[PDB]
């Protein structure tokens, strides 16, 4: 049979009341011919792409039609805590909340997803994620590929696993609290190995790693290069040519790739050196989508310069915050042992060479920052507003992968896990790798967040977040 076409999320803008409506609800999807209950925004799975313009405000009306509470967080958007949609941003089942977003950051591809306390991994795994396309005046002048769903296409890549009855098989247990929830089936905008027909010339892909726990590494099947033009928080100063592009959970990159007549190629993900993630079929390069060239000229450009990246400032005298990530040693060792028992040696491929003892020992609060599992009622500190700070994040003490994300900002990486960042990672980021080493970022918060609607800082391996690896902080 033929591959399905890549689903394209609808690109949504405001009505004359300046409103965008998002409904959160459950329905059915089909995977490999089997129905499954899934959740979506404005549909049964995933969500639309909300289009925002710098300097304009929009109001979003969010209707929770699930039977459990949820929240809606705009990952990558710099907005006050009151509208950030972290765990305090509860939307009751059957209720509605509205937020007004005053967009004030450069063009970028951001995304949105639930942030329900202790249940974010399940709610994302069940299907909830959407996209945010921010435009500004600068980016349109570049004449990049811009025809949505033709030569400018979002690519949301996620894994799932399913039970024999076809349902999504999600669990937050001792194993997944240690190594994450991951599966054996790869979805691309919700479809299994789709094709996308693209015109000859440049094709812009807006890549999102929407997995709960799996890191990805994109490349092409015939080794044509990818030209990175943007990271989480917007354009790079100039394109960066790569042969492979690692993408951590929750990160976005935009790339241009050449499309030539008569030569289809796949976007693939290459095996990664992360525990659990190289079990077949992910022990080998895995297709993401087939690009099918069409003999119609594509009009977009790859300009030599994209934007101006400001210099880093002097670091002397800036506030230095320390954030020590940790995992309880026993629950780390127990969850790694369960992984090894289940899958054997392959669960460490590519890596470097039972009684109840009470709530003190519960895995639901085993992961921590600065010795504390996330306490929604106690922000750990009060950060300055409008001031650069250096945040130092350490994963020394365990060897798991922690893509560390800070709400309310786009930062600059100073050190990523003990090395200067790669050139395509040196611009605006909202995530930094922490794995057995130490990272340092330069952050500035332009908006307030009070104790009642605090910003989060957390590992974006969702099962770690949900079992305590998160803190709240206020600004202003
Ligand atoms: Cu996120
Ligand atoms: Cu976020
Ligand atoms: Cu983590
Ligand atoms: Cu978050």
């Amino acid at each position: 049979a033929e591959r399905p076409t890549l689903p394209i999320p609808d690109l949504l803008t405001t009505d004359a009341r300046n409103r965008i409506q998002l409904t959160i609800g459950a329905g059915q999807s089909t995977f490999g011919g089997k129905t499954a209950t899934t959740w979506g925004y404005n549909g049964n799975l995933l969500g639309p792409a909300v289009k925002l313009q710098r300097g304009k405000a929009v109001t979003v009306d969010i209707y929770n039609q699930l039977t459990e509470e949820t929240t809606l967080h705009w990952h990558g958007l710099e907005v006050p805590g009151e509208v950030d949609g972290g765990p305090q941003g509860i939307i009751p089942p059957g209720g509605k909340r509205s937020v007004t977003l005053n967009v004030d950051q450069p063009a970028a591809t951001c995304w949105f997803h639930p942030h329900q306390h202790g249940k974010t991994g399940r709610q994302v795994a069940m299907g909830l994620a959407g996209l945010v396309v921010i435009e500004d005046d600068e980016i349109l002048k570049l004449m990049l590929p811009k025809q949505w769903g033709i030569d400018d296409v979002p690519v949301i890549v996620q894994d799932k696993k399913f039970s024999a009855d076809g349902q999504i098989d999600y669990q937050l247990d001792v194993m997944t609290a240690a190594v994450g929830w991951f599966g054996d089936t790869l979805l691309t905008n919700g479809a299994i190995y789709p094709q996308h027909a693209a015109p000859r010339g440049w094709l812009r892909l807006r890549l999102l790693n929407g997995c709960n726990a799996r890191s990805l590494n994109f490349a092409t099947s015939d080794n044509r290069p990818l030209y990175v033009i943007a990271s989480d928080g917007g354009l790079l100063p100039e394109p960066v040519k790569v042969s492979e592009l690692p993408v951590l959970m929750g990160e976005r990159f935009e790339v241009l790739v050449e499309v030539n007549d008569n030569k289809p190629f796949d976007l693939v993900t290459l095996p990664v050196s992360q525990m659990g993630m190289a079990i077949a079929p992910f022990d080998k390069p895995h297709p993401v989508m087939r690009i099918q060239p069409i003999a119609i000229s594509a009009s977009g450009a790859l300009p030599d310069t994209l934007s101006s990246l400001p210099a880093l400032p002097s670091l002397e005298g800036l506030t230095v915050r320390k954030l020590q990530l940790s995992m309880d040693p026993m629950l780390d060792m127990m969850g790694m042992q369960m992984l090894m028992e289940k899958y054997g040696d392959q669960a460490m491929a590519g890596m470097d060479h039972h009684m109840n003892h009470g709530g003190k020992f519960d895995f639901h609060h085993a992961n921590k920052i600065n010795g504390q599992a996330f306490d929604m009622n106690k922000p750990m500190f009060a950060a300055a507003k409008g001031q650069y700070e250096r945040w130092v994040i350490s994963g020394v003490g365990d060897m798991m992968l922690h893509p560390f994300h800070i709400h309310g900002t786009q930062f600059r990486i100073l050190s990523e896990n003990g090395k200067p960042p790669a050139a395509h990672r040196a611009g605006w980021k909202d995530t930094v790798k922490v794995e057995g080493n130490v990272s340092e970022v330069l952050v500035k918060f332009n908006h307030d967040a009070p104790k009642e609607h605090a910003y989060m800082a957390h590992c974006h391996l969702l099962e770690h977040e949900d079992t305590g690896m998160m803190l709240g902080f206020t600004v202003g």
Side-chain angles (χ1 to χ4, degrees):
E2 294 193 49
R3 298 189 172 87
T5 54
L6 179 70
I8 306 299
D10 286 347
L11 189 59
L12 302 181
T13 58
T14 47
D15 59 25
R17 292 143 37 59
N18 205 38
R19 298 178 94 113
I20 290 168
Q21 178 180 281
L22 294 174
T23 292
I24 318 179
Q28 297 298 301
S29 300
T30 299
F31 303 103
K34 203 111 152 176
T35 198
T37 302
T38 57
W39 298 358
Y41 299 111
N42 291 359
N44 291 326
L45 179 64
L46 287 173
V50 170
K51 188 172 204 195
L52 301 177
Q53 182 87 16
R54 186 179 195 159
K56 300 178 162 201
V58 306
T59 297
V60 186
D61 294 323
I62 308 161
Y63 297 87
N64 180 14
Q65 299 186 353
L66 302 175
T67 64
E68 60 179 84
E69 288 175 351
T70 191
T71 81
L72 194 161
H73 169 59
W74 309 91
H75 181 138
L77 198 70
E78 299 165 16
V79 296
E82 298 83 336
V83 298
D84 185 57
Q88 295 163 300
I90 291 168
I91 314 175
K96 175 204 200 175
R97 291 293 183 271
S98 299
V99 295
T100 295
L101 303 179
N102 288 281
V103 181
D104 193 22
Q105 66 195 87
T109 307
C110 293
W111 62 301
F112 63 92
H113 65 77
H115 227 304
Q116 184 63 15
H117 184 210
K119 302 187 173 56
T120 295
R122 179 165 179 267
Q123 300 198 343
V124 174
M126 285 303 293
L128 295 180
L131 288 170
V132 181
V133 169
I134 308 173
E135 283 185 356
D136 65 15
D137 288 351
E138 289 69 29
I139 195 163
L140 297 180
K141 288 182 205 132
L142 295 177
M143 308 308 317
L144 293 169
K146 65 170 194 281
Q147 299 294 350
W148 187 254
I150 296 179
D151 65 359
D152 178 9
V153 325
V155 186
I156 303 166
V157 181
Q158 303 180 294
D159 63 331
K160 294 190 197 305
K161 51 175 183 182
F162 300 88
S163 35
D165 66 3
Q167 299 308 322
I168 294 164
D169 177 21
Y170 180 80
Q171 57 279 132
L172 175 61
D173 65 17
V174 164
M175 190 184 85
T176 65
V179 301
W181 186 75
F182 65 89
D184 62 357
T185 301
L186 198 64
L187 303 179
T188 309
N189 297 352
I192 297 172
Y193 195 6
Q195 64 173 307
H196 181 68
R200 178 203 311 136
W202 290 119
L203 170 60
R204 176 179 183 181
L205 306 179
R206 304 177 186 243
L207 301 165
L208 168 60
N209 180 347
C211 299
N212 282 36
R214 175 180 294 283
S215 62
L216 298 169
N217 182 6
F218 293 108
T220 61
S221 58
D222 62 4
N223 312 308
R224 70 185 65 210
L226 299 176
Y227 291 89
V228 187
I229 62 161
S231 56
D232 302 326
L235 295 168
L236 299 179
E238 63 178 344
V240 176
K241 186 185 172 176
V242 307
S243 56
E244 49 193 70
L245 179 56
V247 185
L248 302 176
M249 298 80 83
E251 282 190 334
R252 292 81 61 209
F253 286 96
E254 302 182 40
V255 301
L256 270 57
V257 63
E258 180 174 358
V259 178
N260 303 105
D261 294 359
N262 301 316
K263 196 159 192 170
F265 59 100
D266 295 317
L267 182 69
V268 306
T269 181
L270 302 179
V272 300
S273 293
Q274 184 187 345
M275 190 167 329
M277 301 304 162
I279 307 308
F282 292 106
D283 62 323
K284 302 224 183 158
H286 193 299
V288 175
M289 45 184 287
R290 190 146 279 188
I291 292 76
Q292 291 284 352
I294 299 301
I296 297 170
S297 172
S299 323
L302 182 65
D304 289 334
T305 309
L306 299 163
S307 68
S308 190
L309 192 60
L312 302 172
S314 173
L315 290 192
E316 211 252 43
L318 300 177
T319 297
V320 173
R321 306 201 187 269
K322 200 218 257 206
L323 295 71
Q324 173 71 65
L325 311 180
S326 66
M327 300 182 70
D328 175 78
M330 98 161 331
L331 290 161
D332 201 7
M333 140 177 354
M334 291 181 37
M336 270 167 52
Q337 184 172 317
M338 300 168 68
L339 184 73
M340 296 314 294
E341 288 177 348
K342 181 162 178 130
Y343 298 105
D345 298 332
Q346 192 65 28
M348 297 284 190
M351 304 302 292
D352 251 277
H353 200 256
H354 78 269
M355 302 300 297
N356 187 351
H357 297 284
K360 171 179 188 312
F361 294 102
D362 175 353
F363 70 85
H364 289 91
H365 308 279
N367 287 316
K368 299 175 193 166
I369 311 181
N370 292 340
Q372 310 164 232
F374 179 55
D375 182 345
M376 189 152 65
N377 295 340
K378 190 192 299 175
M380 176 170 307
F381 57 79
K385 184 195 212 183
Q387 283 304 339
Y388 284 115
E389 304 188 340
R390 298 153 68 180
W391 291 21
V392 175
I393 310 106
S394 177
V396 175
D398 64 76
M399 296 287 311
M400 301 308 93
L401 174 63
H402 311 289
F404 195 78
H405 172 56
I406 301 166
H407 290 205
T409 189
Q410 292 288 338
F411 61 64
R412 306 290 302 278
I413 297 173
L414 303 179
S415 178
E416 181 153 43
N417 213 44
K419 295 175 209 302
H424 67 285
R425 300 178 67 82
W428 294 114
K429 296 290 281 79
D430 61 43
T431 307
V432 59
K433 184 170 158 197
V434 175
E435 182 185 338
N437 210 303
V438 178
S439 294
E440 182 181 356
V441 304
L442 181 76
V443 61
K444 176 183 310 179
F445 304 104
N446 298 325
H447 311 277
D448 297 329
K451 153 182 15 121
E452 296 82 13
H453 296 286
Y455 286 138
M456 301 293 111
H458 61 93
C459 177
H460 215 288
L461 193 164
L462 299 180
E463 288 64 47
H464 287 180
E465 178 183 338
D466 279 340
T467 57
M469 197 178 287
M470 177 152 72
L471 61 83
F473 65 97
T474 57
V475 173

